[model samples]
Every structure is written in structure tokens, then in C-alpha cells.
Target: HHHHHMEITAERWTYEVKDYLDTGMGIIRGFRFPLLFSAPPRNQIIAALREILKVNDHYFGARLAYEPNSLDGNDLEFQNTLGHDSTGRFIPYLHRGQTKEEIVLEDAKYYDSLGPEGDWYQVPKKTKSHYATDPYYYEIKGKVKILMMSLMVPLYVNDQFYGVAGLDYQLEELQQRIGVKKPFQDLGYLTLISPKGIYAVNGFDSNRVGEKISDAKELEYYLSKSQEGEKFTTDSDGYTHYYFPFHIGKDKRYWVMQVSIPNS
Candidate 1:
């Protein structure tokens, strides 16, 4: 909890998100389509994702996903788990820490639940490079239902989208990093809203991750003009709100990082 005067900057915000998407580029560098003879081994898949999570300081989560029919002729296999952060009260996703046996969602609601993201699963048909989507959220059930920022990276093999690497960055602790301790946390908060106004992150509304920033005046102004300069204004609530863009890697879209503060 950075309960201090942590200044928010545009460069800081851009690098912050790039760090997450860039990690995917780093993790996927080790594997490709050539390795899957009969198929990617269950044990191997688990190990790869686990290794990536181990180095994650944010202590959020990571995922491994295969395209439809990519594995076993129509089976979409995926593995989602937590990072190395063994922290306070909030229990993290302990690498398939749910269920007696690994619960692979092969049911209807599973693939049907892909929503807007279903496109990333099909990305290999067009491009053979690392692509990270705008930060978003989703739900997963096991011992408990986990909600977090969903990130996807397509796995290309023989110029085909063999599968995808899915990752969920825990949003609440955005300022925190691995192998280090913060002297204090940000006093106010950095509210992240996508270009379309979705609440990618909000300190005031912790439950707004899966929601959207209101499409009203303040929200509309920031979404449209924040890219021009460092702009902010005070509202009736005495909160100073400003917006900055989080530039993602090798992608067209960027996450707008909005800052809320008080008069010094």
C-alpha cells in the first residue's frame, strides 16, 4: 500500500503495462510449434507457465491456452495460475491450486465464454508474431472464483496459431514488484480505463475491473484529449483527476491510465 505521495507520470504508466505484455514476449521465446510432435505435454505446459509466474513480481497470474482443434483435434486446453508473490490475507492462484485433479474446461460454457477475446485464439491464421491485447478482465472458478486482468499471446507454429499464452495480471497491486518491498503505497490511486471506457483498474472502485468508466463528461474528455498533454482538473468532490496513456508493445491500442489526486 503506497500511502505516500507517489507521483504518476506518463512514461511510468507506459512502461508499467509494457512490462506485463513484454513478459509474455520473454516467456514465449522458449517454445514454438515445432516442439509439439503428438502434442504439447501436459507436464511441459505446466512447467513453462509456472516458470514464467515464478519471476513475476506483481504476483498476479499467468495462463497457457491452445487454439481450437490445435490440440487433440478440437480440444482447447489452457492452464491459468498465480505468480511467486506469497503475500498477505488475499490467497493467490497457486498453480492449479483448485480441485483434486487439474480441471480442464472442455465444456460448452468454456469456449463459449471466450467473448471478445475469442479473436486472439484465432490470431495465428493471420500473423506469426507476439501480440498483446488491451488489458481486460474475466472470471475463473475453482476452489474460489478469481477475477483479474486477462492478457493473451498467440503461439505460432509452422506459421499457424498453434495455441496462445494467456495471462491475468492481478490489478490491485499494480505498483508492487517482485523481490522487493515498497516503503509505502500510492496514497491516491491510478484508475486505468481502456480507450473504450472499460474500468481496467480503479483504486476507488476495486470491483470496477470488469466494468466501464462512465461515458460522461470527465470520462469522455480524458479518453479524447489525454494524449495531447498532462491534463487534470478538480471536481466538486475535491479530487484531482488526470489521464495518461499506457502504451502497449507492438499493438495499436493503449490503456488510458487516469490519476486521482488531492490539492497539495
Candidate 2:
């Protein structure tokens, strides 16, 4: 019961993740028009966010957070976040306040700031146009509490930082994409891991995600390979580990998609 070809299995899994995010990115790209030209009517903005959730049920939520006065005729902050209710209906959480200026004490506890380094909002402002946060927990402030991964695409107009359009996926939703069901008969398993050694998806144990890989040297090895953008393999414990660098956006950084196959 095996496919007999480990590389092909690993490669397919890599593309699956990239292609899925690419589709989401394309959808987000279209909204640049609304943000670029000027703030469209508020209703028009919600309709756009709503469409994203409708088109992709896999997404846990959709968000558009803008800098103060970034939109024409608006001199204050604006952020709209939309997620589903138990009935699968969309609900919006709108916020207009001072938290956008700095990482306040409350937000620091609830959100992941670059820690004393910069404001949380600045994450997208400073990062590549398309950025994906490491898997983390975010409570939609009483709306929902779940471990989620977010894809953030920055919005810029006239070279000025405008806002960020984000799409959120429950970690489980993403892990489900990187599943345990190996179509090939091989006894290998797939794991989606971050450059820093944390597991993004673990076929062996879902709970292991967000946890570090046990082997220090192995983590170092994987981190190095993640930068190379090439396929590399190593055998251990009668299993062969095949690693593929998964490029998420236009950035040079990538995640490691490893396939561990039992040696015949």
C-alpha cells in the first residue's frame, strides 16, 4: 500500500497550499480599487468583505483595517472585521478608536505585537505586500475565540500606507487542507512547519501544531533548507524525510512542507 514516489507526493502538497493562498490573494487584490480611489460607501466595503466570506467558506473571517485619515473625507480611524455566527451568517465588528496609534496594554495581552519593537498594525505596514502571520490565537473580541492563521495584504495609495485587507482561517481549517489522508499507500506523513521549527500542520498529532520540533539540530537543518527553495531529503528511523520549501507570497521566505516516508 504505497505510491512508491515520495517526491511527487511532497510536491503536490506544496502546490496545494501555494495555490490556495494565491486564489485568496487574487480576491483581496481586487479590493485595492475601493481603497485606492477613496473610501467607497461603507455599505460597499462590507459587501466586498462579505463576498470574500461567501466565496470561501474555509475562511473564518475577513478584515479591512485602515489608518486614520487614510480615506478621503475621513479624519479618524476605521476597522471592520467580519466573521460567521453559528447560523453561518456574517456579523461585523466595527471599531474606531485610539488603539491604532500604539499597542496598548489591553491589545498587547490579546494580540501578538512584534513586542516592544513596533505596533501590531505596523506588521502589515512594514512587511511585504502580502504577509501571513505565524499561527496564533485571536479572539474577535467576544465574537469568537479560536486559533487562527491570517493572510494580510497591505493596501497602499500614492505610495502612502493606507490599510490592510486580511483573511482569517481557523488553524484547523488550514490543517485540514494539509491532511492525514495520504492517497498513496505509503506509510509516510506530511507536516507543515514554520522556519523557526514550529509545526503548522502535523499529520501525526494535530495538537503538536504551534509547538516546536523536538530535535534542535534538525530544526536548524530545516531552517537552513527552508531558505534554499529546493527539495532535500534525509533518512532517519527507517523513514525518509523529504522537505519542500513552500513559498507563500511574493516574499523570498517560505515554510517547509515535509513528507516522511517509511523506507521499504
Candidate 3:
């Protein structure tokens, strides 16, 4: 999303969608509400994505999957994308081509194989690879090339791996829909990097998508001294000033929402 520094007011809140996007904050705040209040083994993240997609069709998108919790053993994987179609119909796109019904059926069989041990993570890698390579890969086709960067929230319930919820977006579509001109077309550009060090820059083929941040020493130094809940600024170059450690989720995954300010 384009960087904007705006004073929040009642009028801004009236445009709920704009306020939500501009703040880069979720409505529920820290995913606290659903995490604390809701029942487990449900698609809370998908629900949030569906709501966002309803209000803003241009920017936000999500894909969800239930995986065997590596940290805690649990069987059955569930995954889907909740969004609208070209005809404005609300639909949930399952990760593969299988419908929700088919997923349930397969999940039951897979769940049984786990036995009473609930050792979901012990499943053979080859079997999982076979499942992933099946028809599911070719079914969905909306905005396939655009990478959705997100921070994962690991969830466990009753000592079992329930699922993970992620907040994600496509940067190019977000810029176009918000009508943001590049603050600086030269001196390269700024990007949001994932906790795992995947960097995203819109509309440049030469730019790699998932490169790691090579400046580990500097980053670690800055991060260590940073306050828990304060925004810090750093100048990457003469023209690029970046706000570092833009925290996301309760896990505190680091992010940099950069601004290319003009030199006066």
C-alpha cells in the first residue's frame, strides 16, 4: 500500500474501509477479538478477508490453508480463498479444485489415518507432496502472478495445532487502486519485507521478489534497541526514508513501510 500520513478524524472513520486500509491495522486490532473470543477450529482469518474484499475490491486478497501444526500435532488440513467473482457472487475458492464437500471427504480419510495419536505432522512428506501436486494446483486463476505477502499467526487449541491466520495484499494493485504516484521514480524504491525476508516491489521485472535482507548486522542492532511499541525512522539513502519495524500481528513480525520523500 502507498504510504500516507493522515490525521485521523471522525470523518475519516466514516469511510470505514479507507480508515482500515490507511492505518494498515485490522478492525479487530491485533487479531485479538477473534483469537480470544471465538471458538477454535474455525476460519476466522478467511472471514476477515471476506469482509475486507467486500468493502474494497481493488487491493486486499487472501489464501488460507489448514496445515498439520508442526508445533502441535493435529490432523486434517483446510484451505480456501474467500472473495467475489467477476459477476459479483460471493464464493470461497478452495485451494485446489475440490469443493468444500470434497475437501471434507478427503480430510476425513486423512484424519483417520492419523489414528488416536493425533500425530499429524508425522505423515510422510511424499504423501503430502502427492496431495499438493494433484488437480488443486491448476484450478484457481485470479491474480496468479501477483504475490500476496503476509505474516502468519500460529494458533493452537486444546494442545492441538488448529491453524494459522495471515494478513496479506498485492502491492501493485494496491498502488493503482489508491491512485498513488511513485514518490521517487529514481534512486530505486522501497519495499515491505516479510518476517522471513521476502521483499516486494511493484512493476519491475528486474527486481527480485523474495530476496533476503543482506544487512543483518545493522537490522539486528536497530531492532534490539527499538522500543516495543514505537515507530522508528531510518534513511536508506539521500531520497529514501523508511519507517522500520512496522509491527504486524501479535507475533511482532518486522515490516518496513517506506516513503520516498522529495529532497527540498
Candidate 4:
């Protein structure tokens, strides 16, 4: 069998997928300074938010969260839009008169958490992108919690941390996209892995998408020692696992793309 050919082919496919997914984060980062300095009217801000959805319609939702008084000199200013309405268009949603302090306490819990998971906000530099968050359930306005994953791009103004421009992808929608793509042409499957080892896209089984890769011995062996720009392959359990780092940003901890082929 052409293991070499398979490895090269998988590497190319992994990077292509990385570029497709990184497009949204890249565009959001480009909008950081414009939104921060322009201070345009709320309508204009809404339009900017809409532009993001237009550029990457694959995004489940797009949002901008800024520091206090940073936008419009208000206590709290947040712009968010989630999913398409009945008319099949992304519309901006408004938060009705929630105070800055209350939002800080509650909103922080929602996105930028106090826990280690919220380290996306703690970066001081102009980072390219936050490592995609592991999938979790989040409620919309006290409604039921839906499985969601977030990809965030941190913004900085004049060397000060401003806020973050972010997007959320429904897990089901992402799984559908990942599952349909076949890089190995029926011989193997590809998986998208988060920096933290959660399976962003588990081609073998949709049920394993949000689960930890460490749960499996062979996968954990590769994950435990993964690094940026490295490629690894090993045979285990009658299958060959090809592991490649999927670098999307300036952060050193990169995501992983694994291509698994069954041994003949």
C-alpha cells in the first residue's frame, strides 16, 4: 500500500480544511480596529455584524463583546446574532437594558468564564485566534441548552486588550459538514481535534465529536505528545493513525487532524 501517498494526501486535505475553517476567524480579526475606532451608530455596528455572517454563512452565530464604555460610552454594549430567522436571514439581536455590572457577572459566565476554559480573554498580545472551544451546552435566554462550539479572535487597541470578535458553530451543523467530507476515499477517515484533545470532528462516529481523545489508548498516545508542525503515524488496533498538526493561528498550541486507515 502507498502509505507515503496516503500521508501526503491527508496532509494536504488537513490544511485545506484548516484554511476553510480559519476564514471566519481571520475576517473577524480584520474587523477589530474598524469597529473599535469608528464607534459608528448601532445600525452601522449591526451591519458590520451582518457582514461577518455574509462572509461565512457557515457560522451559527456572530458576536462582538467590548470592554465597558469602549463602545458608545455605555455601561455595557454587546451585539449578537444567532441562527437564521424564518425568513432565512441573520438578524442582530438586542439585549434589553441590562446593566454593565450585571452583564459582566453573568455574561462572563456565559462566554469568557473565570475558569481555565476562559483563557481566551487573558491573552495580552494581538493573538491571531483563540483555540476553538470544546463543545458544550449553552442556553439562549433561559431556553434549553444546545450543544455549541465557539471560535474566538481576541482584539487589542493601542496595546490594551479590547475584547473579542467571535463565532459559534452548532455541533450538529459542524458534524454534518465534517462527516460529509471524505479525504481518504473510503479507505480511511479524518478527524478534527481541539488543542485540549476534544474531538472537534470524529469522522468514524458522530457521537465521539465532543468526547475526549484521551479516552482511547492509541489516540491518547499521539495526543499526549502532539506539537506544532509535526506529523506522526503509528499502527494500532489493526489501523494506522496519521496525526498532523493543524495550525490556524499564531498560538503555539495547534489543533490536530488525524487520518486513520485500516491495515490490510
Highest-scoring model, lDDT: 2
lDDT of 2 at 112: 28
Q: Which stretches of candidate 1 lie over 4 Å from their true place?
A: 1-10, 13-17, 28-40, 54-60, 68-109, 112-143, 157-159, 173-188, 218-239
Looking at model 2, residue 122 earns an lDDT score of: 57
Clashing pairs in 1: 1-185, 2-184, 2-185, 2-186, 3-185, 57-178, 69-74
Please give, for residues 77-167, the per-residue lDDT of candidate 1 as tens digits. 2222132111111112323334323423211112224454444444433555455443444444443444444444566545555655555
Give residue 188's error in model 1 in angstroms: 4.1
Residue-level lDDT of model 2, residues 122-179, one tens digit each, is 5678863676666666554545455655666777667777767766666776778765
Model 3 spans with C-alpha error above 4 angstroms: 1-55, 58-60, 67-144, 177-190, 201-240
For model 2, which pairs clash? 1-185, 2-185, 2-186
User: Could you give candidate 4's per-residue lDDT for residues 147-213 as a string of tens digits?
Assistant: 6666667666565666666666767777788655777666777788777777777778888877776
Clashes of each: 7, 3, 2, 0
TM-score between candidate 3 and the true structure: 0.43
Reference-based lDDT, each prediction: 0.47, 0.62, 0.35, 0.61
For lDDT, candidate 1 versus 2, the one ahead is 2
Q: Single out the weakest 10-residue window by summed lDDT for candidate 3.
A: 129-138
Q: After best superposition, candidate 3 residue 66: deviation in angstroms? A: 3.5
Local lDDT at 55 for model 1: 59
